[PDB]
Amino acid sequence: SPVCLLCLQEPGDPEKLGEFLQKDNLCVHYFCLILSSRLPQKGQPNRGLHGFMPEDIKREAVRASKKICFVCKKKGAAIRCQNDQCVQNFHLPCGQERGCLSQFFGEYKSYCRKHRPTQNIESCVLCCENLSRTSVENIQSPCCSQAIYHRKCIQKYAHTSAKHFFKCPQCNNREEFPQEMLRMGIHIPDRDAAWELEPGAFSELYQRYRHCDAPICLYEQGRDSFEDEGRWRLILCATCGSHGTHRDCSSLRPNSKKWECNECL
Amino acid sequence: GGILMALKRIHKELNDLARDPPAQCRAGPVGDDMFHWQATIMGPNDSPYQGGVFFLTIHFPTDYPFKPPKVAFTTRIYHPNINSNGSIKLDILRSQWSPALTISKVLLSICSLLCDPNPDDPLVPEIARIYKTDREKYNRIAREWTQKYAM
Ligand SMILES: [Zn+2]
Ligand SMILES: [Zn+2]
Ligand SMILES: [Zn+2]
Ligand SMILES: [Zn+2]
Ligand SMILES: [Zn+2]
Ligand SMILES: [Zn+2]
Ligand SMILES: [Zn+2]
Numbered sequence A: 001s002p003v004c005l006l007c008l009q010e011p012g013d014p015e016k017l018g019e020f021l022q023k024d025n026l027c028v029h030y031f032c033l034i035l036s037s038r039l040p041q042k043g044q045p046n047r048g049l050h051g052f053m054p055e056d057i058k059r060e061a062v063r064a065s066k067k068i069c070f071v072c073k074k075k076g077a078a079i080r081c082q083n084d085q086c087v088q089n090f091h092l093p094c095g096q097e098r099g100c101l102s103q104f105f106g107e108y109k110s111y112c113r114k115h116r117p118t119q120n121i122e123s124c125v126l127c128c129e130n131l132s133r134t135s136v137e138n139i140q141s142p143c144c145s146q147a148i149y150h151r152k153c154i155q156k157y158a159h160t161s162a163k164h165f166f167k168c169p170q171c172n173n174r175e176e177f178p179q180e181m182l183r184m185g186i187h188i189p190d191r192d193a194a195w196e197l198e199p200g201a202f203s204e205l206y207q208r209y210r211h212c213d214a215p216i217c218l219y220e221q222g223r224d225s226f227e228d229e230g231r232w233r234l235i236l237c238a239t240c241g242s243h244g245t246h247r248d249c250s251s252l253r254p255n256s257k258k259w260e261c262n263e264c265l
Numbered sequence B: 001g002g003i004l005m006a007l008k009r010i011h012k013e014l015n016d017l018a019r020d021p022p023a024q025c026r027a028g029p030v031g032d033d034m035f036h037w038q039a040t041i042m043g044p045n046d047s048p049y050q051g052g053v054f055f056l057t058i059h060f061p062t063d064y065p066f067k068p069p070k071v072a073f074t075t076r077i078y079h080p081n082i083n084s085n086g087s088i089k090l091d092i093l094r095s096q097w098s099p100a101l102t103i104s105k106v107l108l109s110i111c112s113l114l115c116d117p118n119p120d121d122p123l124v125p126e127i128a129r130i131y132k133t134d135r136e137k138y139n140r141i142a143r144e145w146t147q148k149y150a151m
Helices: A030-035 A054-064 A092-097 A151-165 A176-184 B003-019 B103-115 B125-133 B135-149
Strands: A020-023 A026-029 A138-140 A148-150 A234-236 A244-246 B025-030 B033-042 B053-059 B070-073
Touching: A020 A030, A026 A030, A026 A054, A030 A092, A138 A151, A148 A151, A151 A176, B003 B025, B003 B033, B003 B103, B025 B103, B033 B103, B125 B135
Parallel strands: none
Antiparallel strands: A020 A026, A138 A148, A234 A244, B025 B033, B033 B053, B053 B070
16 A cells, blocks of 8 residues: 555546655655655755655655645645635645646646646647537647647657657747746656656667678678677678678678678679 | 547548548558558559559557657568568658658658658668669669569
8 A cells, every 4th residue: 555645646637646656665646746845855866766755755844744724625735726815735746636737847836726827728639539618738839839738648749759859830930929828837858758767668670680691601690799900890782782791701801891792793 | 538539530531531532642551450551552654663562561559649650661662761560760750750741741752752762861781881882773773673573
């Protein structure tokens, strides 16, 4: 039964509460960790849990013990509404249940329903289904054409493509569009894109052909391994570039320099 | 949602592809698996690939359209940006992917890549050197591989 120190609930959906970090005998949602209103980030992201020291996380838990979530009426509320005229405390999942908004820039301010940011305000192109009725689950873009998307679809786009490639789907805006997305509550991770972070992603792509296709290979490490000099280095065909070998397997010399394979002859 | 969303979008793209097919391309689901498609590109006219039939395999990710599809040739082709494994060095399949893009626009990009290679960011450096230095030899070898592997 693993649980989050700050919100006191199961790990749940990473898309909504972040990766469920557990390390050095502590367990916290990543969003709960960075969105808690008073938790100092005081380390290298190597050190501790992404720059948050366990001593400080524990003490934040202790403070939050003295706070009642206005949603579930139970103690442990680690997030406070950042409006000046509001004193409402809430758990992150409870705030999401009541439509609270969390910002992921600057001081990572969070707001309750009454005081959250707004925008003045068909089919979401990303998913190709009709826009949600509740205009808090939809979102415009200031960049161009005043395009409206599902909030969930834009968040999924931000997570997969991430900061470096997150842009207007139409005009490729990378300055005003993501700033407007940030101020309304879109997580934009500073990480490489998802299709780059796949296991073995773009591995057989490029992967310059490096394989010895001679009738017999003269080398122990085999057709699969090579070196930099000597008769054990790799040579590739002059035209196809996709058929190659250890130099001595064709028993050739540095005095010709132009290897064409069996096929390109 | 999620996988259901990808399924609905892939059906939409399949219907659009059927009604407004890109030039010299045709593509579709393999059997009852709609995350696996097979495509054919006819070698463009006035290119060394004219007369060939070039077969492509398409795999849609589970997070489509938020990840680009994986597209590969199954036909050997002599091209600076296509290696012996059929892998394609194409920006919209890696770094310029947008969820607004469609498989139909991927296929147009690949056809244009056949007409207009990018030897300055090559996937096969020898073929790029030949393309830049001796274009007629490039065209001759591309025609020879079209006849040998794509006809
Ligand atoms: Zn939590
Ligand atoms: Zn609560
Ligand atoms: Zn408030
Ligand atoms: Zn949508
Ligand atoms: Zn725009
Ligand atoms: Zn060898
Ligand atoms: Zn060769």
